Design an enzyme around this catalytic site. Structure first.
Site, PDB file in Angstrom:
ATOM      1  N   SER A  45      16.310   6.361  40.145  1.00  0.00           N
ATOM      2  CA  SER A  45      17.088   5.091  40.287  1.00  0.00           C
ATOM      3  C   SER A  45      16.526   3.911  39.455  1.00  0.00           C
ATOM      4  O   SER A  45      17.192   2.851  39.427  1.00  0.00           O
ATOM      5  CB  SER A  45      17.220   4.733  41.745  1.00  0.00           C
ATOM      6  OG  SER A  45      17.989   5.723  42.397  1.00  0.00           O
ATOM      7  N   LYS A  48      18.958   2.222  36.958  1.00  0.00           N
ATOM      8  CA  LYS A  48      20.043   1.330  37.456  1.00  0.00           C
ATOM      9  C   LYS A  48      19.828  -0.103  36.963  1.00  0.00           C
ATOM     10  O   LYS A  48      20.840  -0.800  36.720  1.00  0.00           O
ATOM     11  CB  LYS A  48      20.167   1.418  38.974  1.00  0.00           C
ATOM     12  CG  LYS A  48      20.669   2.775  39.439  1.00  0.00           C
ATOM     13  CD  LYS A  48      20.523   3.020  40.929  1.00  0.00           C
ATOM     14  CE  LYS A  48      21.151   4.337  41.324  1.00  0.00           C
ATOM     15  NZ  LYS A  48      20.604   4.855  42.593  1.00  0.00           N
ATOM     16  N   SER A 105      20.070   0.540  45.705  1.00  0.00           N
ATOM     17  CA  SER A 105      19.955   1.833  44.972  1.00  0.00           C
ATOM     18  C   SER A 105      21.197   2.689  45.211  1.00  0.00           C
ATOM     19  O   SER A 105      21.093   3.928  45.166  1.00  0.00           O
ATOM     20  CB  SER A 105      18.688   2.601  45.338  1.00  0.00           C
ATOM     21  OG  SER A 105      18.274   3.379  44.231  1.00  0.00           O
ATOM     22  N   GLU A 141      24.693  10.448  38.915  1.00  0.00           N
ATOM     23  CA  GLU A 141      24.154  10.602  40.279  1.00  0.00           C
ATOM     24  C   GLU A 141      24.930  11.712  40.980  1.00  0.00           C
ATOM     25  O   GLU A 141      26.144  11.713  40.903  1.00  0.00           O
ATOM     26  CB  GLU A 141      24.237   9.274  41.027  1.00  0.00           C
ATOM     27  CG  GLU A 141      23.257   8.243  40.501  1.00  0.00           C
ATOM     28  CD  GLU A 141      21.806   8.458  40.891  1.00  0.00           C
ATOM     29  OE1 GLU A 141      21.483   9.528  41.504  1.00  0.00           O
ATOM     30  OE2 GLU A 141      20.988   7.576  40.574  1.00  0.00           O
ATOM     31  N   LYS A 209      12.565  -2.486  41.033  1.00  0.00           N
ATOM     32  CA  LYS A 209      13.548  -1.407  41.286  1.00  0.00           C
ATOM     33  C   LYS A 209      12.747  -0.135  41.514  1.00  0.00           C
ATOM     34  O   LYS A 209      11.952   0.206  40.632  1.00  0.00           O
ATOM     35  CB  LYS A 209      14.490  -1.208  40.110  1.00  0.00           C
ATOM     36  CG  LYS A 209      15.513  -0.102  40.350  1.00  0.00           C
ATOM     37  CD  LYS A 209      16.553  -0.558  41.383  1.00  0.00           C
ATOM     38  CE  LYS A 209      17.342   0.593  41.967  1.00  0.00           C
ATOM     39  NZ  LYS A 209      16.535   1.384  42.915  1.00  0.00           N
ATOM     40  N   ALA A 212      13.375   7.414  43.673  1.00  0.00           N
ATOM     41  CA  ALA A 212      12.979   8.664  44.327  1.00  0.00           C
ATOM     42  C   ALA A 212      13.856   9.783  43.786  1.00  0.00           C
ATOM     43  O   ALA A 212      15.009   9.534  43.481  1.00  0.00           O
ATOM     44  CB  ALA A 212      13.081   8.518  45.817  1.00  0.00           C
TER      45      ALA A 212
END
EC number: 3.5.2.6
Length: 263
Positions: A45, A48, A105, A141, A209, A212
């Site tokens: 993430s 992002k 996230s 994702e 940010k 995982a």
């Protein structure tokens, strides 16, 4: 500081995994401390932030609006969509999607924003064009979190990610208003509590940010400093550990405590 490098190597021992680490001076871009700065790690993430940087770039060029409202469906929703799952009927603005992608996230928010720019290959083109020839997004994702060993898909290097974040937050790449909005979203991060934030004293600034993924993948990118202002960039990545989420969080927090102690 050498004592922080001692703690990073200790983190590798505790996690039985590689840890990549870099500290940049936010003003000069000078490397203050590093470990495996040129090895590849899954971004998870942390991408992002780069994605919302691409979006802000488009807003600056008259090719996107923060206020544009996007409608989506049940079948757009992927795992871990805490904001996007609540707006099936009303949709969300580009502003709300960036807020949800960076602060919570939100995975579906990231997919919807990737659709606005033409997908992972367009984020990679954006990064190429600003002089980052390392960082690459290949998948959506949630598959971008797979963290297959030696797979260069959806990876960065600590040094590349740190340089890119510095160019997004302080360059001429974005307008002043876009820079300010990107750091404001990262400062409002709600899901990085157990990482650098848990070592950060009252009065310090942090915009971050977290990430995982699979195979114990864990990471954070941050602009932080004392006296309520950012003055350094920190990037921490790990992959390959079998340690619990709690143990990976504790190792990154302890790297944070050492970075603060030896500021």
């Amino acid at each position: 500081h050498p004592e922080t490098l001692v703690k990073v190597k200790d983190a590798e021992d505790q996690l039985g995994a590689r840890v990549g680490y870099i500290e940049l001076d936010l003003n000069s871009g000078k490397i203050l401390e590093s470990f495996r700065p040129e090895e590849r790690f899954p971004m998870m993430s942390t991408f992002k932030v780069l994605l919302c940087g691409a979006v802000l770039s488009r807003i600056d060029a008259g090719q996107e609006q923060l206020g544009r409202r996007i409608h989506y469906s049940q079948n757009d929703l992927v795992e871990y969509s805490p904001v996007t799952e609540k707006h099936l009927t009303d949709g969300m603005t580009v502003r709300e999607l960036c807020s949800a992608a960076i602060t919570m996230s939100d995975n579906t928010a990231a997919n919807l924003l990737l659709t606005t720019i033409g997908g992972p290959k367009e984020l990679t083109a954006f990064l190429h064009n600003m002089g980052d020839h390392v960082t690459r997004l290949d998948r959506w994702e949630p598959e971008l979190n797979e963290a297959i060993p030696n797979d260069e898909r959806d990876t960065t290097m600590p040094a590349a990610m740190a340089t890119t974040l510095r160019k997004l937050l302080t360059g001429e790449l974005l307008t002043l208003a876009s820079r300010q909005q990107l750091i404001d979203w990262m400062e409002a991060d709600k899901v990085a509590g157990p990482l650098l934030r848990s070592a950060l004293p009252a009065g310090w600034f942090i915009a971050d940010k977290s990430g995982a993924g699979e195979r114990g993948s864990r990471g954070i990118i941050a602009a932080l400093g004392p006296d309520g202002k950012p003055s350094r960039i920190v990037v921490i990545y790990t992959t390959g550990s079998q340690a619990t989420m709690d143990e990976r969080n504790r190792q990154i927090a302890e790297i944070g405590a050492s970075l603060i102690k030896h500021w």
